[PDB]
């Protein structure tokens, strides 16, 4: 069968890790600044 | 206009177009209809309505 | 309950405490950044001169995520002055932390400031393996995969960690063949980390999907045995999918693959609703691929030209000759199947454009072919939907595509056999060459004829006069 | 304390959400009766 | 199925007069030179300036008397969030590549300006319009 030349590849290929940024955790989101923050008088 | 390509019927309006350029008696009727139409244009514009109303 | 505190204080003209606005926008982190961004900007507005070391991280990783380059760096440089008053204890994790964000933005804006604060940081904390692994990378982008070694040897590091298994497959996915290494090597690594470290990891499951796709595709099928065993294989990967969308429903890939394996099985409408569906969740190359290639499985070829064009301009920028090829193909079906001439006038473009591009002999056959068919169709039209002009352009065109035919056949290894080429180049020639001087002559004679009758007329018009 | 005090915005499976998150629950369930179910 | 498909960015949102209805317009995203002046309902599907909003035309919604739609049935309408059905009022074949498709859903008038390929498949009596957000 001598017709157009063409190649079928479709593209499902996963992208490299971002490794973004890293969020930082506030004071307020560990256990002893909680205690001491609610048992406050 | 039968005879100018670029003044005539549109071909992709009509069957025909291909037999239709250069017959000159189709031209001759053609040429008739305009002619009355032009009469009936200088009746109307000079005797009936001389102020060019046309909404009547 | 937050809200309603934030209210209440509002109405009673009390401070409102920030740390309700931190824990506002710790919660809004997974359903609005723009509303914890927001609450952060209240927060930090009602600090004031307390604004802290995570205020401003958190606020210029905001604007990252919001593609707010200048005040990203505004939100890090502020981090990184009040970095200054960080207690000592904490400090040298904070200043790793803020220098690995600051050489992810310069990996964004520029590669070499990020390689140098990469390996500031290595020297800093060997230990870290994001910062090894994205300093890898960017060697491995530099070197086009000539640090193998380096590659292999972070996996040794860090057997254990989901990143560094990921970054090494998607490595070895890369340039397996490029290093000559086992086919079944990555399966084998892949099955190891989910048997053995995490059987919910979707990144494994899909490289392990696309692989079993991959030996499916490529499996010789010669009776009824093997295409089950190449729709065993696939069932396989569709099993991976199936897990990876049981763990995560809304994952792309997963759809895509099942996709493809539709359209190995010509299930082309499921695989255009998931093409669709794709395309209005992401935009990338090759989604706008795929959905030209399902059109053209669906027969929809102008649907196929414009998605073609839209990944041409958008990613590939008028470049690749691959999505020039596929556009020069759907304008062929286009011609062939609609009996348009533009169309076989635009794919002939095309076809020169890439073949100036390229000059390779796969391309001087399509162009031979394009002008071969466009013969042939001119041939076939009335002398009333053709001119002159065709006529004349589709000669040249055939007496071109003889002799690259020619020179085809003249090639060591060409894309058909010389002796096919000879074959149809002397078909071309004997036949076809004839009847186009055959069709030319006689639409000569009908323009004459034409003029012939357009000088008659205007004689007995002026007769008549 | 570095691995402590980090915090990712997004998840491993959650990062092909992002900032816009879309559902192929019936996706999946015509995978599972046309695939896994397929006869 | 789908005659038409597209994804459009919301330039300018007019309430003017009404109150439960709005004009917006908007540019095609992968194309430009494709324009879209629409009337919604605001209060089933408020927009805002500079939204995306993925507009899919088709001329049934399979995959005369209307009937509340069963629980049971599945139509194109499962995947949208806003379906209103109307009838074409116009087909402007206008000059070389400008083709204006007007569409009137009960009074809440559309027009759509486009090349003819890309809108050569809507000479529909009636059409319906599926907006996803």
Not at chain 3, 81 to 110: D, F, G, M
Not at chain 3, 220 to 247: G, M, P
Not at chain 3, 248 to 272: C, H, V, W
Not at chain 3, 394 to 401: C, P, Q, V, Y
Request: glycine share 4%; proline share 3%.
């Amino acid at each position: 069968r001598q017709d157009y030349i063409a190649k079928v590849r479709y593209q499902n290929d996963l992208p490299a890790p971002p490794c973004p940024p890293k969020l930082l955790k506030y004071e307020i989101e560990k256990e002893a600044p909680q205690k001491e923050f609610l048992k406050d008088s | 206009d039968l005879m100018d390509e670029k003044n005539s019927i549109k071909p992709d309006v009509i069957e025909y177009a291909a037999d239709i350029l250069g017959d000159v008696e189709l031209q001759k009727e053609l040429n008739s209809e305009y002619e009355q139409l032009v009469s009936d244009r200088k009746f109307l514009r000079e005797i009936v309505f001389v102020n060019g109303d046309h909404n009547w | 309950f937050l809200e309603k505190y934030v209210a209440v204080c509002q109405e009673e003209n009390y401070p409102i405490l920030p740390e309700a606005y931190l824990v506002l926008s710790r919660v809004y982190e997974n359903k609005d950044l723009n509303v914890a961004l927001d609450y952060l900007m209240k927060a930090n507005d009602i600090l004031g001169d307390k604004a802290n070391v995570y205020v401003l991280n958190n606020l210029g990783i905001y604007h990252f995520f919001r593609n707010n380059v200048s005040q990203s760096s505004d939100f890090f440089a502020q981090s990184l002055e009040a970095l200054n008053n960080v207690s000592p204890q904490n400090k040298e994790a904070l200043s790793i932390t803020l220098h690995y964000n600051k050489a992810r933005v310069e990996e964004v804006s520029n590669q070499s400031e990020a390689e140098k604060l990469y390996s500031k940081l290595m020297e800093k904390c060997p230990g870290y393996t994001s910062n090894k692994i994205r300093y890898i990378y960017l060697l491995a982008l530099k070197s086009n995969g000539n640090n193998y070694a380096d590659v292999q040897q972070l996996l040794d590091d860090f057997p254990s960690d989901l990143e560094v298994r990921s970054f090494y497959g998607w490595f070895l996915k890369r340039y397996g063949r490029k290093n000559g290494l086992k086919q079944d090597l990555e399966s084998q690594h892949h099955k190891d980390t989910l048997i053995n470290y995490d059987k919910h990891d979707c990144y494994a499951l899909l490289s392990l999907g696309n692989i079993y796709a991959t030996i499916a595709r490529e499996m010789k099928v010669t009776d009824q045995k093997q295409n089950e065993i190449k729709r065993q294989q696939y069932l396989r990967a569709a099993q991976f999918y199936h897990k990876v969308l049981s763990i995560d429903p809304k994952n792309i890939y997963a759809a895509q693959g099942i996709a493809i394996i539709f359209s190995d099985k010509e299930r082309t409408g499921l695989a255009l609703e998931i093409f669709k569906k794709v395309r209005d969740t992401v935009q990338d190359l090759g989604t706008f691929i795929n959905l030209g290639h399902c059109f053209m499985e669906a027969k929809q070829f102008g649907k196929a030209i414009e998605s073609y064009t839209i990944a041409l301009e958008k990613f590939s920028n008028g470049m690749d000759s691959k999505l020039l090829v596929l556009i020069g193909r759907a304008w062929y079906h286009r011609g062939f199947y609609e009996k348009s001439m533009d169309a076989y006038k635009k794919a002939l473009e095309v076809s020169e454009q890439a073949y100036q591009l390229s000059k390779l002999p796969a391309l001087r056959f399509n162009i031979v072919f394009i002008q071969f068919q466009i013969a042939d169709f001119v041939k076939s039209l009335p002398n009333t939907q053709r001119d002159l002009t065709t006529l004349e352009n589709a000669l040249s065109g055939l007496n071109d595509a003889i002799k690259s035919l020619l020179k085809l056949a003249e090639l060591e290894q060409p894309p058909y056999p010389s002796e096919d080429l000879k074959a149809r180049a002397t078909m071309g020639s004997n036949t076809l060459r004839n009847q186009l001087e055959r069709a030319i002559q006689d639409q000569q004679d009908y323009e004459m004829s034409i003029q012939e009758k357009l000088r008659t007329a205007r004689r007995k018009q002026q007769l008549d006069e | 304390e570095i691995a402590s005090n980090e915090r990712v915005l997004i998840d491993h499976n959650k990062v092909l959400r992002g900032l816009k998150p879309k559902d192929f629950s019936s996706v999946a369930k015509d995978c599972e009766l046309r695939i896994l179910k397929e006869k | 199925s789908a005659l038409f498909d597209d994804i459009f960015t919301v330039q300018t949102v007019d309430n003017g007069r009404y109150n439960k209805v709005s004009r917006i317009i908007g540019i095609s995203t992968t194309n430009s030179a494709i324009k879209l002046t629409l009337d919604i309902n605001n209060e089933m599907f408020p927009v805002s300036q500079d939204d995306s909003l993925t507009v899919t035309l088709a001329n049934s919604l399979s995959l005369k008397s209307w009937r509340p739609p069963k629980p049971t049935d599945k139509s194109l309408a499962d995947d949208y969030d806003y379906v209103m059905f109307g009838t074409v009022y116009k087909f402007e074949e206008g000059d070389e590549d400008k083709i204006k498709v007007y569409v009137s859903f009960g009074g809440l008038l559309m027009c759509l300006e486009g090349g003819y390929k890309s809108l050569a498949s809507l000479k529909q009596d009636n059409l319906y319009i599926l907006i996803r957000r």
